[PDB]
């Protein structure tokens, strides 16, 4: 398939070819143009706070070691021995000053340098250019308020620029709250769906909530329980949707600080977020302070999602076009009391974890939609994301980004897929920028 010419995503992101969720050649092409090019979630400071602390993480289908350096920085490396390519580290986390390959014993530092080679003098003599044999290093590793992302592409924008308009929305909770920590370890489950299915669902799908999650809403007694089975409609201006140039986007449901959490956590959370909101009004303004305690369903392009307040943090790790490995962490505010933190974490896993009853509601949706993308008569069909098109604005006086001033819409899908098409048809970052010079105009075209 010719990705320079192939219209996988229609103008304004209005539709996508269903094959994008099933096509293996395209999946391979995404490895290069999506995953090797963009910012990918690795871990959080709270997971590797001390020198020598490390976790493994996936970047696309690659595995990397993410290690806290002695100088307090974080470097990431391919989890692959430089000799004959055996996987270096077999655990998910620990603390160490280096990694030794179990095949022939090569010793690498936490800084990736080849530090020792057994019988070096006797076998290699002085031939071995160790300096040139360090673990393949991830070019870019940056932090967003403790959230660590990596990018194999040195030409990429700094992470903050990459987050674009989405950053403004996350800052109240990520920055102004005093900071978040990630409670590990994450749950890990494989689903038979394309990574984009849950990615698009978290980026801008509030429409499915009432119907998909009818049973869970009803059962949990959560603060959104009124939408069960589409019984009620979110009030006028119950929230909005936004998206950005590099693909990230999110839905905003005003005030839903306790989020998906069942009645048992609603009072405390609503009390906690309200108290904090009150202090924040003075520091960052009423609007932003409200955003802080408002439920954000967001995808950080391409495969990292989250539900602030609910505190769900996801990585949709790609395996193949119909296979995805879902990592589920809990995000908690650092200043919450320990016991609440503990209970929020359990509740996050309870609702969206491996046995999350909410996440379970979504399985069939994500899986069949992805699998149908391989079906002959559906390959060339069009997935629609035209809801709210011609009503999104850009450059609003209050809410930045391409913004749908409605809780339910497909604004965020449009922005996500616009950025996806641009990358897939682009050979590098400059081409992407060239392909994205009129991004917001494309997204608001009939407005």
């Amino acid at each position: 398939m010719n990705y320079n010419n192939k219209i996988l995503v229609s103008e304004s992101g209005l539709s996508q070819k269903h094959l994008i969720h099933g096509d293996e050649e395209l999946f391979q092409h995404e490895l290069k143009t999506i995953f090797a090019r963009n910012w990918l979630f690795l871990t959080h400071d709270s997971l590797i706070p001390a020198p020598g602390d490390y976790v493994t993480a996936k970047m696309g289908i690659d595995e990397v070691i993410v290690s806290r350096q002695n100088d307090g920085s974080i470097r990431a490396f391919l989890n692959v021995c430089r000799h004959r390519g055996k996987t270096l580290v077999s655990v998910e986390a620990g603390n160490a000053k280096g990694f030794v390959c179990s095949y022939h014993g090569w010793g690498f530092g936490s800084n990736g340098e080849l530090q020792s080679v057994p019988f070096e003098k006797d076998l290699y003599g002085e031939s071995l250019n160790k300096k040139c044999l360090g673990l393949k290093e991830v070019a870019r590793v940056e932090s967003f308020h403790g959230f660590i992302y990596g990018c194999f592409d040195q030409e990429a924008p700094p992470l903050m620029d990459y987050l674009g308009d989405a950053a403004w929305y996350l800052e109240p909770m990520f920055k102004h709250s005093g900071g978040l920590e990630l409670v590990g370890p994450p749950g890990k489950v494989v689903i038979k769906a394309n990574w984009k299915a849950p990615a698009e669902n978290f980026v801008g799908d509030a429409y499915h909530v009432g119907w998909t999650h009818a049973s869970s809403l009803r059962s949990g007694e959560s603060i959104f329980s009124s939408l069960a089975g589409n019984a009620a409609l979110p009030p006028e201006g119950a929230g909005l949707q936004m998206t950005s140039k590099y693909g990230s986007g999110m839905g905003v449901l005003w005030d839903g600080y306790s989020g998906v959490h069942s009645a048992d956590l609603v009072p405390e959370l609503m009390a906690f977020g309200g108290a904090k909101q009150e202090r924040l009004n003075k520091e960052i303004g009423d609007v932003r302070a409200r955003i802080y305690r408002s439920h954000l369903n967001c995808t950080v392009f391409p495969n990292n999602s989250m539900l602030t307040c609910s505190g769900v943090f996801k990585v949709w790790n790609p395996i193949d076009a119909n296979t995805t490995e879902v990592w589920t962490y809990a995000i908690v505010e650092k200043d919450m009391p320990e016991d609440l933190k503990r209970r929020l974490a359990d509740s996050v896993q309870r609702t969206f974890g491996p046995a999350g009853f909410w996440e379970s509601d979504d399985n069939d949706n994500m899986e069949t939609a992805s699998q149908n993308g391989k079906k002959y008569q559906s390959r060339d069909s069009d997935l629609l994301s035209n809801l709210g098109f011609g009503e999104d604005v850009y450059g609003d006086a209050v809410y930045p980004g391409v913004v749908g001033k409605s809780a339910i819409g497909e604004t965020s899908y449009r922005g996500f897929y616009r950025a996806y098409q641009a990358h897939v048809s682009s050979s590098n970052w400059a081409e992407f920028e060239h392909a994205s010079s009129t991004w917001h105009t494309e997204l608001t075209k009939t407005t």
């Binding site: 603390n95 489950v189 490995e325």
Partner: protein, 193 residues
């Protein structure tokens, strides 16, 4: 029986658990345990979740299934949360899950799912202190089939505490499962182990 300094792969917890079953073998207790677990598996298998709750689960239950992070066997510095809870339910939390299962809009329940449990390796021993606390250990293979060609099989060891409830019925007051598979290859773990 076990010296963990010699038996280097054995966890302190595991060594603790095996000790309670090795000392006193109460043949009739093992049989009670067997019956209790067989009936519980039967109710779960036919999806009589309310009956399960009513007849098998104690009001003070802790229903816990954890997933332990993979760490070096020789790891002794890294001390952050070792496991997350796939389940950590009190009676009311189980009840939320039960209602979610029975809800007519749980679309994933149509067509009806098929469960088959195989309980084996039952061991039973009264607690040393609480004469009313029955320790039951058992292994489960849980087979779930749905939607024509979806088949998921779960495997686990269950460390239970059962205690006579109201009406003298022994009910589950604690189930602890350290799930063997770090990354689930079963779509989800939405089953009652």
């Amino acid at each position: 029986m076990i010296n963990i300094q010699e038996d280097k792969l054995v966890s302190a917890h595991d060594a603790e658990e095996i000790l309670r079953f090795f000392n006193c073998h109460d043949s009739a207790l093992q049989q009670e345990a067997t019956t209790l677990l067989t009936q519980e598996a039967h109710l779960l298998d036919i999806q009589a979740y309310r009956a399960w709750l009513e007849h098998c689960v104690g009001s003070e239950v802790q229903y816990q299934v954890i997933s332990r992070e993979l760490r070096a066997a020789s790891e002794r510095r890294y001390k952050l949360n070792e496991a997350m809870n796939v389940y950590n339910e009190n009676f009311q939390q189980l009840k939320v899950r039960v209602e979610h299962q029975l809800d007519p809009q749980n679309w994933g329940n149509s067509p009806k799912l098929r469960f088959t449990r195989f309980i084996t390796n039952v061991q039973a021993a009264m607690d040393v202190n609480d004469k009313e606390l029955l320790h039951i250990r058992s292994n489960v293979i849980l087979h779930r089939a749905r939607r024509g060609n979806q088949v998921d099989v779960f495997y686990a060891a269950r460390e239970d505490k059962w205690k006579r409830g109201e009406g003298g019925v022994r009910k589950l007051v604690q189930r602890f499962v350290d799930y063997p598979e770090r990354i689930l290859q079963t779509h989800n773990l939405m089953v009652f182990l």
